[PDB]
């Protein structure tokens, strides 16, 4: 039931959300873990190596470059963490055999990052999993998150809402197509962006490092 405009936007997003791989040596991280203070050195990389993907994905979002310049910065400063939690969640249930559950905890350190990072990311994943959401839903739901016109430091909210709007519009349809049985699927997807905004306090901010 999507319109040309939507199917076009969707494909574009899918495509882009895809050039970020390489699922093979996500096994180097999956099994056989050189653990402990080793494990730090890897994530710190991985993190870092998530920003460059994030920003590549964002530049190619229909209308992004056309935004202001600082607006562009403030978007991304606002999304970096949210969008990493959303990446994790896809992994934690879409990749990986049958969940429960990396369960390293008897190996959690700081960063500073302790045990109040573990628990958050847990409720969240299990709740996203509970949504049994397809990749298209991960892709769009991610652009919805970057293109958020209520980030602090935006000057042209309506410039950003014009861009977010169509993507919300598509996601609604997909929902209303792939699962008409439960007319409250879209509302749950939105609902989760809120647990995202929340974690933005317990992960005070990921500035500086590394």
């Amino acid at each position: 039931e999507l319109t040309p405009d939507q199917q076009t936007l969707l494909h574009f997003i899918m495509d882009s959300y895809n050039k970020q791989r390489m699922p093979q040596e996500i096994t180097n991280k999956i099994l056989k873990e050189f653990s402990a203070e080793e494990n730090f050195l890897i994530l710190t990389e991985m993190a870092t190596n998530h920003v460059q993907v994030l920003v590549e994905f964002t530049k190619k979002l229909p209308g992004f470059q056309t935004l202001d310049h600082e607006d562009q910065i403030a978007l991304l400063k606002g999304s970096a963490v949210e969008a990493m939690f959303l990446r994790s969640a896809e992994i934690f249930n879409k990749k990986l055999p049958s969940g429960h559950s990396d369960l390293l905890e008897e190996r959690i350190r700081n960063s500073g990052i302790s045990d109040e990072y573990i628990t958050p990311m847990f409720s969240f994943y299990k709740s996203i999993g509970e949504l049994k959401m397809t990749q298209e839903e991960y892709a769009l739901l991610t652009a919805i998150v970057i293109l958020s016109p209520d980030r602090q430091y935006i000057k042209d909210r309506e410039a950003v809402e014009k861009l977010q709007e169509p993507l919300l519009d598509v996601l609604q349809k997909l929902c209303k197509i792939h699962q008409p049985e439960n007319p409250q699927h879209f509302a749950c997807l939105l609902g989760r962006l809120t647990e995202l905004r929340t974690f933005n306090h317990h992960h005070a901010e990921m500035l500086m490092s590394w």
Partner: peptide, 16 residues
């Protein structure tokens, strides 16, 4: 004393 926002400025082209 960077901190983040610079990183993003760079990543927007330079730091590739």
């Amino acid at each position: 004393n960077l901190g983040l926002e610079d990183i993003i400025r760079k990543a927007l082209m330079g730091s590739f």
